[PDB]
């Protein structure tokens with residue numbers, strides 16, 4: 005990781021701050037509020053007349 | 054690469070071609086950080102006894 009950060013196959017003696025080359029797949033989450041209003045298709049399709 | 058796109062991978066993917074620009078910014082700050090310890094040493098450590 006240090007070698008990639010410094011763009012070289014040889015690194016000198018010392019302390020180096022490296023870049024983050026680590027990868028993780030992570031999750032994917034979607035959230036919505038409760039649907040309670042519905043829609044009056046009953047008066048349309050279940051009509052008595 | 055944390056300050057710019059951050060956690061956005063799709064963004065980071067088009068920061069790669071800049072490359073050396075991030076290197077210049079890191080390099081300049083690193084040089085300053087080292088100098089700050091040199092300054093302290095030069096003022097206080099006059100005598101090694």
Ligand SMILES: *[C@@H]1O[C@H](CO)[C@@H](O)[C@H](O)[C@H]1NC(C)=O
Nearest residue numbers: 044045046047048049050051
């Ligand atoms: C009509 O009534 C049936 C039986 O209760 C119900 O399952 C159906 O969903 C109702 N139709 C509508 C549009 O609500």
